[PDB]
Enzyme design. Structure first.
Site, mmCIF file in Angstrom:
data_model
loop_
_atom_site.group_PDB
_atom_site.id
_atom_site.type_symbol
_atom_site.label_atom_id
_atom_site.label_comp_id
_atom_site.label_asym_id
_atom_site.label_seq_id
_atom_site.Cartn_x
_atom_site.Cartn_y
_atom_site.Cartn_z
ATOM 1 C CG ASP A 57 -34.949 -10.194 -30.061
ATOM 2 O OD1 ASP A 57 -34.377 -11.307 -30.097
ATOM 3 O OD2 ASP A 57 -34.305 -9.111 -30.120
ATOM 4 C CG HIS A 354 -38.347 -12.020 -22.254
ATOM 5 N ND1 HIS A 354 -39.412 -11.263 -21.837
ATOM 6 C CD2 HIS A 354 -37.865 -11.415 -23.356
ATOM 7 C CE1 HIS A 354 -39.633 -10.266 -22.703
ATOM 8 N NE2 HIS A 354 -38.681 -10.320 -23.615
ATOM 9 C CG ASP A 398 -39.412 -19.490 -14.000
ATOM 10 O OD1 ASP A 398 -39.238 -19.017 -15.158
ATOM 11 O OD2 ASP A 398 -39.933 -20.632 -13.826
ATOM 12 C CD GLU A 407 -32.508 -11.507 -23.227
ATOM 13 O OE1 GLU A 407 -33.763 -11.280 -23.181
ATOM 14 O OE2 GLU A 407 -31.764 -11.239 -24.221
#
Ligand SMILES: [Ca+2]
Ligand code: NA
Ligand code: NA
Ligand code: NA
Ligand code: NA
Length: 426
Positions: A57, A354, A398, A407
């Site tokens: 993020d 991610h 994965d 993460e």
């Protein structure tokens, strides 16, 4: 097998380069990252550009960012020989964080602790360079305290003052001046930062602040030699066995520092912590040998304990066994199960961590929510990132949208990088 720990160390430093926010330098080694979040600022217009994005993020979360910095710096100080020829690169890397903390410290008793609304930020999928949403900034003040975030920030800056002493004394002096003032803010205005910055309570909820008050005092004692800081640390000594070492809990780290200063109780506490993590202790071992603490960030928790174990072994604490444990855990991360859990490294690494920016195709192609769910490998390789990792029976997927497995985060790499340096000096 044997692993190329130094290659991983070098890739870890590139992970942090890929997390940079703000105006990137000309020697930016990440070709898929460019300038971003150039308007990040405080409520008084103060420049808050720079720092690291937390994870996949684009939020700048002060508590894990500061812990990451302190932890990285600790390894660069105490495991310097292991860093070896990569030490200068590692130092320049962490300066990015330290510079940002100093900008956050807008006045003596105001410290910015977050830039970005986690909900608004997570509602977007795309490049950080192309963000258009509002990015609110929240600070800590006497009427909205956060001893945890402020104490950790003080620790980072104090540890930095030690690290930079010899090579850049003027910078080290700036770091220490801010560390002293930030620690006074943390000590004099008591509270949990995620009550004062409520957005954070959804993401990095702090369980307690007294452990940061001890940790920060210990770092300031190391940085200044002033007895008053040891006296403060002694007000907040760890009680019982730490559950883990992480962005939230500093006790195990404080135990190492206290042991280094001759605290007998702490040394026995540290022994009791370590023996639980060694094989046949209280920590669950997966069938393939990972010391598994929790569902979330299992590799991070193991790496963090491996780092503590290596530093404890430098104090003569359970020396050989601690090193054997650290190596076993690092080897699990690097390849002992037959695949790597470090992006860009080794045999069959994770291909779909991610991570918004890594998920995007090369410019100038558009990037949006379809990139979150694409079964293809990430178009960009987030070299160096340690993923969340497996469940308690070694199962791992994965999948970019298996948040538990895939993460990546600043804090996941922090102990890990130091533990690599520690293994390199054996
Ligand atoms: Ca804490
Ligand atoms: Na360098
Ligand atoms: Na409360
Ligand atoms: Na406790
Ligand atoms: Na046992």
């Amino acid at each position: 097998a044997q692993y190329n720990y130094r290659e991983v160390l070098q890739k870890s430093i590139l992970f942090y380069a890929a997390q940079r926010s703000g105006q990137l330098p000309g020697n930016n080694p990440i070709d898929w990252r460019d300038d971003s979040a150039l308007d990040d600022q405080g409520n008084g217009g103060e420049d808050l550009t720079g720092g690291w994005y937390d994870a996949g993020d684009h939020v700048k979360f002060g508590l894990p960012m500061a812990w990451t910095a302190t932890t990285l710096i600790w390894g660069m100080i105490d495991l310097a020989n292991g860093y070896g020829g990569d030490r200068n690169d590692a130092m320049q890397s962490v300066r990015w964080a330290l510079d940002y903390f100093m900008k956050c410290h807008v006045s003596d008793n105001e410290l910015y602790g977050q830039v970005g609304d986690g909900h608004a930020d997570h509602a977007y999928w795309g490049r950080p360079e192309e963000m258009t949403m509002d990015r609110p900034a929240w600070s800590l003040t006497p009427s909205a305290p956060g001893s945890d975030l402020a104490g950790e920030t003080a620790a980072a800056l104090a540890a930095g003052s030690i690290l930079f002493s010899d090579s850049d004394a003027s910078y080290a002096n700036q770091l220490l001046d801010h560390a002293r003032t930030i620690y006074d803010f943390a000590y004099n205005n008591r509270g949990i930062y995620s009550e004062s910055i409520p957005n954070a309570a959804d993401f990095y909820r702090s369980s307690a602040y007294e452990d940061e008050l001890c940790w920060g005092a210990l770092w300031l004692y190391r940085a200044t030699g002033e007895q008053d800081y040891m006296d403060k640390a002694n007000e907040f000594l760890p009680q019982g066995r730490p559950w883990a070492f992480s962005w939230d809990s500093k006790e195990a780290g404080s135990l190492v520092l206290l042991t280094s200063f001759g605290n007998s109780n702490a040394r026995a506490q540290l022994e009791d912590f370590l023996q639980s993590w060694f094989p046949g202790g209280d920590i669950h071992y997966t069938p393939l040998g990972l010391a598994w603490r929790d569902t979330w960030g299992s590799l991070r928790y193991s790496a963090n304990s491996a780092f503590i174990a290596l530093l404890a072994a430098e104090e003569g604490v359970l020396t050989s066994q601690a090193r054997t444990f650290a190596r076993a855990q690092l080897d699990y991360m690097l390849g002992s199960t037959g695949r790597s859990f470090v992006v860009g490294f080794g045999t069959n690494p994770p291909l779909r961590p991610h991570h918004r920016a890594a998920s995007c195709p090369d410019m100038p192609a558009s990037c949006g929510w379809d990139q979150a769910s694409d079964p293809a490998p990430n178009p960009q390789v987030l070299d160096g990132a340690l993923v969340g990792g497996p469940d308690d029976q070694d199962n791992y997927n994965d999948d970019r949208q298996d948040y538990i497995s895939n993460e990546v985060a600043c804090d996941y790499n922090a102990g890990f990088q130091g533990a690599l340096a520690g293994i390199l000096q054996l």
